[PDB]
From Swiss-Prot:
Keywords, comma-separated and alphabetical: Enterobactin biosynthesis, Isomerase, Magnesium, Metal-binding
Originating species: Escherichia coli O157:H7
Pfam family, one: Chorismate_bind
Gene from which this protein is expressed: entC
Enzyme active site: K133, E183
Cofactor(s) the record lists: Mg(2+)
Protein name per Swiss-Prot or TrEMBL: Isochorismate synthase EntC
Binding site for isochorismate: G200, S201, E227, A289, R333, G347, K366
Domain of life: Bacteria
Details of cofactor binding: Binds 2 Mg(2+) ions per subunit.
Keyword Nucleus: no
Length: 375
């Protein structure tokens, strides 16, 4: 299985692994949408260093945190290795062995009543003109007795989530950021780009007809359509100023994960160039699916209600090459592991039609993707 110091990315676009490490890159990604920002200038330079030093076709991979004022977890590997997503999906339709793991401690940060009161405050605030949507999140901390094998976990992740954007990111503190993301934030392929934001959620059902009825009810739910509209209206505005052309559908489609129905709107467009995967990714992130709307207002509520720092959770994860192509997906349905400690994360968009218990339960089902991976 995959060694923990290797990047792994599984996607219908480009799926690959990396090896070794040429140079790390931790410049904060704030203002990274401007080609004249320190982030972009330093990026170009390192790609230049890489080629001079004889790195062929250098790639920048890893993760950027929710608040891009914080350092990035990005690097250029010594080498990378394509593989076929399809071959990997076929190989994962198997019984997936598991690491025997003992729990020494488990802890919900916060616990149910506290989270419910947080949702109620945020909901009440969204009832005022001051903000329209706040994304609130919570964690499950688990401590084992043994170092966790991130490679065995990845095999389970893939087997349980063969379709999503599956990532395994080595981290500078020795940890691994692992996950099964359903949300494309930015793909760039030549001059064209796309983004498939999600927001609005309904639990899958084992019964075929009930499953379909759950999806249908989601498309008819005013709360979830409102939650989703605030996201797409935001990104449409942002991308208007920046794209030669832009296609956005007028209503969402349905997408599934193993646990959830989601509302999804596909954006496609042509990039003004002098643009790359990261200039556009930093432009968009975070959307109101992960921060809220208006952005700065929502991030203030988040800072005042959440009893923890998100760090990489709710950021983006992916890759950019020196030609400006790349793909960035939202850092959700995911876990940070280091030695015998795991932190799982989930958020949910809060609007005036949000109930405290409903969003505790929605974040619960979101947490279940990684809880399933761990058993
Ligand atoms: C913040 C998360 O999801 C976002 C995107 C998909 C569904 C979401 C929702 O319905 O609240 C969130 O906007 C998460 O999965 O932890
Ligand atoms: Mg939601």
């Amino acid at each position: 299985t995959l060694a923990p110091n290797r990047f792994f990315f599984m996607s219908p676009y480009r799926s690959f692994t990396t090896s070794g490490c040429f140079a790390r890159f931790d410049e904060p990604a704030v203002n990274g949408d401007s080609p004249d920002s320190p982030f972009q200038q330093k990026l170009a330079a390192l790609f230049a260093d890489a080629k001079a030093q004889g790195i062929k076709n250098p790639v920048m991979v890893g993760a950027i945190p929710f608040d891009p004022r914080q350092p990035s977890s990005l690097y250029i590997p010594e080498s990378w290795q394509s593989f076929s997503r399809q071959e990997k999906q076929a190989s994962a339709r198997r019984f997936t062995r598991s690491q025997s793991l003992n729990v020494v401690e488990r802890q919900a940060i916060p616990e149910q009543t506290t989270f419910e009161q947080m949702v109620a405050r945020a909901a009440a605030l969204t009832a005022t003109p001051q903000v329209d949507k706040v994304v609130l999140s919570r964690l499950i901390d688990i401590t084992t007795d043994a170092a966790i094998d991130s490679g065995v976990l990845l095999e389970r992740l893939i087997a349980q989530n063969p379709v999503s954007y599956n990532f395994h990111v080595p981290l500078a503190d020795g940890g691994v950021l692992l996950g099964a993301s359903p949300e494309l934030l930015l793909r760039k392929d030549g001059e064209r780009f796309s983004s498939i934001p999600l927001a609005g959620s309904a639990r899958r059902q084992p019964d075929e007809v009930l499953d379909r009825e759950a999806g249908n009810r989601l498309l008819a739910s005013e709360k979830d359509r409102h939650e989703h509209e605030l996201v797409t209206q935001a990104m449409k505005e942002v991308l208007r100023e920046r794209s030669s052309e832009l296609h956005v559908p007028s209503s969402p489609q349905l997408i599934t994960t193993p646990t959830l129905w989601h509302l999804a709107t596909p954006f496609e467009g042509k990039a003004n160039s002098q643009e790359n995967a990261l200039t556009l990714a930093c432009l968009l992130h975070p959307t109101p699916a992960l921060s809220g709307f208006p952005h700065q207002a929502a991030t203030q509520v988040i800072a005042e209600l959440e009893p923890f720092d998100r760090e990489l959770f709710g950021g983006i994860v992916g890759w950019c090459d020196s030609e400006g192509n790349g793909e960035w997906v939202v850092t959700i349905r995911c876990a940070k592991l280091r030695e015998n400690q795991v932190r799982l994360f989930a958020g949910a968009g809060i609007v005036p039609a949000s109930s405290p218990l409903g969003e505790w339960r929605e974040t619960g089902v979101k947490l279940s993707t990684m809880l399933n991976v761990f058993g």
